[model samples]
Target chain A: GDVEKGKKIFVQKCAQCHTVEKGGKHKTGPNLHGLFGRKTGQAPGFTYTDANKNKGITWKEETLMEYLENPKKYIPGTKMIFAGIKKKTEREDLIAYLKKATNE
Target chain B: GDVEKGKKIFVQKCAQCHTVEKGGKHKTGPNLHGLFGRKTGQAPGFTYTDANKNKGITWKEETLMEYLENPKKYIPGTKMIFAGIKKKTEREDLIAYLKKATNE
Candidate 1:
């Protein structure tokens, strides 16, 4: 997976609403630092609906990857606006970037 | 992911004990057909230890990927003998092959 390419993709696709940097402020979406092992709706200071709050799924590679493909499909009532990345390689790269960026 | 490369990786790493073909014979390990969404220990005719049977986790890309990294680490009392595939790409490829091969 290409981390650099993933970063570019993130900047274009996600940075407007989400931030991956640690302690970054929540935008339209939440700060996504330390998201991989966390449950949905756990991001501090972010307001989430019961749909996400009550959903017990963990944010692992598979779940996140699947969610990234279709957020509305994955969580019917989700407020996120981006349609999704359709290309498999793009998804893989974006996740690789998230794994690295969100951790540090 | 390269399915062809994944198939070669699967043959080299997992074909010894596991078969992905539908209704394939269970060897040292159980046949992995339709494993993606199934719970552990549900494979027919294969006797799994309590550790595996009680694990109660569904088999998906993330779970399988983590398991492939360190079998004993993932399931402490598992009976599998192979150490594990350490490289991430190898594991991903093997899983890609299994996803294709097991489904058909």
Candidate 2:
């Protein structure tokens, strides 16, 4: 996957509310520094609803696939305000890019 | 709102995977440096799933209210992998806490 393309998407669309830097404060949403493999609703300093607290999910490829389809319908109480992505290929590419960004 | 309390929650539960500082590296999740006004799945240097790329939702109080209810159901292909917040009060409190935490 082209990280550059991913970066463009992030800045143009998602940077308004989320952050991906250390010691960075939450803007309108949670940070995206180390999202892969990380537990759900567990970002520090950010308040998570009991809905998130109760769920003991780990960020995995399959799990991500499910959640990305519809954030609100999946978590039912998450703070994310995104609509679902319709394209499978786009979702796959984004996931691949995210895994690389978070892992390395 | 006690920042200290939120800070504690962040460290104990969320800190293991996410960062709140600027220019930090991506761990298991994305950074939390500045997430308040950011758009979904648009963090710099991070890779997002295509599900996240196309979603043009902005971070808003009402929208977050819905998403926090159920992550997977909300965004079917989201990479979040979280369950849902069951309690209404807890969700409200967490939202308040997050607003404070992210603003500062």
Candidate 3:
């Protein structure tokens, strides 16, 4: 519902290492482009860590909801450095936008 | 220098769904006990998706450095939902603390 809010959060937080637009190049991090319903660590050109390479995860609403709340906890040894989102509503909104943006 | 601050950040940001202690249960996400130098999505009792399962990545400084900047972008379809940390210094400090906490 709030793609704008999610965008703000993404710009303020995620833009540093990631590219949101489709087919963007890999920066210090990976390019999002099409994130929803995608597989973990499957981005092209970007090298994934063993933790992720071995994770065998798939993006889904329920799984994504849990991972959004805590990344390190979900995928131990993952390269992601996010602390996690505490607010349930904010997380939900962000997830909705992500779903819409990625068309998942 | 600021384990306390990092702890605060973790609690405020990450604790909603994750447990920092070792051998914790999987909630909305995975646990962070002994995260350092660990493999991704190999946590016990946690069900990882195909993306991570097939990744075969290892935890290291450089990979982590990049992944911290953006999760979804870094690893598309990753279950992690948080946007990302924007500041370089903040991210460095947090990664330091995460390394200490996870002992990676």
Candidate 4:
């Protein structure tokens, strides 16, 4: 996916903090290249949060869907303050799009 | 003060997902048992969301106040589905009661 609207939202909302491009740098957030199916806090060189380093979560569609809706509540304590996409469709489409962009 | 009521509210709304007792076990949600004055996404053994793992937030009187009022709004892409306490007094009292229980 990573199509029009999805890309748009990601740019507007997440680009400042994250990087989806392969070999992209970790800005405020981690570089989300090949992000799925990975452990939550295992990103190389990035300092993950306490909730994240210890939560031991893996990235997947189901979990991402839930987390996309509300990151803070999902983990109780997070640093990202971007209030989730209000509409379910947008959140879904965005995730699908990002997944398409990162990996197969 | 809404401390008594806040305790009741916490029990009704949050206890099912969290525990407040020190050394309590993690439930579906992280045991909030000593939640205040901690950083977000630091709870051991709980897998946090990606956004949360690096958001670099702290659990403090000020931030929590915003979160309890509307966690979803404060931090997007969270998973805690608890629609925030609508009333100002309720949120304030809840934070106060929790601080007393966790730290004081």
Candidate 5:
């Protein structure tokens, strides 16, 4: 399963901060439930920097892929500090998993 | 020595989730810097449950004490799943440490 690959990659990079579960509360980052419809930094009670606050951006797959590719570059002041995924196939796979998984 | 004790208690309890240092990314919780001036469930990237989301609560000594006493009772739907601190002195000591340590 490629989903396993995505999960493996997520656990290494994003899971340290973000969880993929619905009720899971992540430490450094927010959980990724309904990420497509969710706002950038608007996960309930988690605070965001002024740059992210009132950011007015929505989370769509295309936009998210761009953001995930180079987080700091896309949004200079974002609190997330992950290095972008280096491989294009990984990004595509991750995106595929996120789309399939987030809907549940 | 009380501060040390408080740190001990925190290490045994809160440190598993929340970090006390600046820019320290936590695993299951958020960083505790400026916690007094901060909101309950608000850190940059962490996810919080709905109760915390619309909690409209600030982190003052009295309220935090109550919440620390019994998190489930304090905020039923909150994502903070930690059990209550049992001892009064530990709570006091922890509060003192939180007040002093959260500013950095």
Candidate 6:
């Protein structure tokens, strides 16, 4: 749960598509503000695939970990183009960082 | 057009989604085997959006250069999630590297 390390992972892996700041404009993916405690595909103004909009999943630590491990596997047909984090610790750290950054 | 520098850029920027080696498996993006001299969205077996499949553009040095500057702007509705290379030299180097690697 190293927030710093998680930030690095987000920059290398997720920054291309997502913005963690509140009110940040959607990039190729959506802005991930208030990510936790929300339903999937809830980012306003961002178009989502039916697979993502209808995932019917909540965003929390455990679910985030599983989704970060393999997004396409979790929600097939999603337009997100990430390969997913393969390391367990990396995923945990990313979630830790996300908890603060996304809430801020 | 430094191939070495381009390879570095590719590793930092494109390795997540694309593979330059021939016969490489598709990641988030398609395997870029024989990329040049081919039409857009022609990678065998990789599912492409209609925006890309209908781009009707050929891959070449000039086109690649333009596309790398801003992929979404160049091809609206394209599924590529990349924000694109901003520096001119970086794009040249990447294209140079692609010239050799994608053909190898």
| lDDT, candidate 4, at A51 | 90
Instruction: Kindly list the per-residue Cα lDDT of model 3 for residues A3-96, writing each as its tens digit.
Output: 4445554555656667766567787578755555578888778887888767777755445555655667778777754433444444444333
Model 4 lDDT per residue over A5-59, tens place = 4455455456656766667788767877666667787768888789977777876
Span of 10 residues, lowest total lDDT, candidate 1 chain A: A94-103
| Candidate 2 residue-wise lDDT at A89 | 40
Candidate 6 vs. true structure, TM-score: 0.46
Pitting candidate 2 against candidate 4, the one with the higher TM-score is 4
Q: lDDT by residue for model 5 over B21-97, one digit each (tens)? A: 66777676766665664666777787778787677788655465556565666776555432223344433343333
Q: What is the lDDT of residue B15 in candidate 5?
A: 66
Q: How far is candidate 5 from the true structure (C-alpha RMSD, Å)?
A: 21.9
lDDT of candidate 6 over A1-104, digit per residue (tens): 44454555566666777777756779868887777678998988988999999999987655765565556777877765533333444434433332232233
Better of 2 and 3 by TM-score: 3
In CAPRI terms, where does candidate 1 land? incorrect
Model 5 ranges with Cα > 4 A deviation: A81-104, B1-104
CAPRI tier of model 2: incorrect
TM-scores for all candidates? Answer: 0.39, 0.37, 0.39, 0.39, 0.38, 0.46
Task: Give stretches of model 3 more than 4 Å off.
Answer: A81-104, B1-104
Superposed model 1: Cα runs more than 4 Å off: A1-104, B81-104
Residues B39-87 of candidate 6: C-alpha lDDT, one tens digit per residue = 9999999999999899989876657665665577678777655334434
Could you tell me the TM-score of chain A in candidate 6? 0.75
Least accurate stretch of 10 residues (summed lDDT) in model 1 chain B?
Answer: B94-103
Native interface contacts retained, candidate 6: 0.01
Q: Candidates sorted by lDDT, descending order?
A: 6, 1, 4, 3, 2, 5
Give the true-structure RMSD of model 2.
Answer: 19.4
**Distance from true position, residue A82, model 5, in Å?**
13
The most accurate candidate by TM-score is 6
